[PDB]
Ligand SMILES: O=c1[nH]c(-c2ccc(C(F)(F)F)cc2)nc2c(O)cccc12
């Protein structure tokens with residue numbers, strides 16, 4: 426029971442999400458190998474994802490985390506890139522969407538940098554790039570990212586050589 | 588799927604080498620995220 430509602434480009438909500446995308450691109454140490462070579466995006470569409478059940482699942486967990494963390498959800502908006510983006514919007518996140526070999530263990534990973542999440546659109550390490558051209562730096566094919574509401578609760582701080 | 592560190596609900600990966608890199612975050616329960624926006628885009632070739 427997911428619906429997707431288009432945001433008008435004239436709408437401040439669209440513009441806020443576009444600026445979050447654009448302002449958090451950076452250079453990557455692979456010179457663009459995984460995600461491609463770019464300084465900015467062409468944003469083609471932004472849709473709101475609405476699902477009453479998935480939303481309730483989320484707010485139920487958030488309340489438990491918030492109470493366990495002395496009344497602080499520690500909620501953020503973060504990017505997620507995945508080959509499963511089309512499954513995620515219908516069924517929600519679960520173990521099928523985890524990065525088994527991640528830096529900080531098997532869990533679901535999110536980025537403040539839009540361009541970090543873009544590295545996973547076509548799979549781990551960018552996989553073999555777009556389906557049509559096998560190009561990790563394809564400038565023609567349309568990509569999708571999610572911008573998500575994430576409950577962090579008490580977060581363990583791990584400094585990392587990356 | 589792995590478990591969050593004892594008493595914690597997520598991990599915050601803070602890059603310590605590259606100063607322009609922002610943080611990455613891991614959760615261990617899918618219920619702790621909601622995919623609020625779907626963004627369709629192309630990367631752009633620099634000029
Ligand atoms: O958005 C991310 N997706 C992923 C990601 C990594 C793997 C998969 C997989 F395995 F399901 F195909 C899906 C998404 N990893 C990230 C990361 O390691 C750091 C910061 C952000 C991400």
Ligand SMILES: [Zn+2]
Pocket residue numbers: 555556557558559560563564565566
């Ligand atoms: Zn392509």
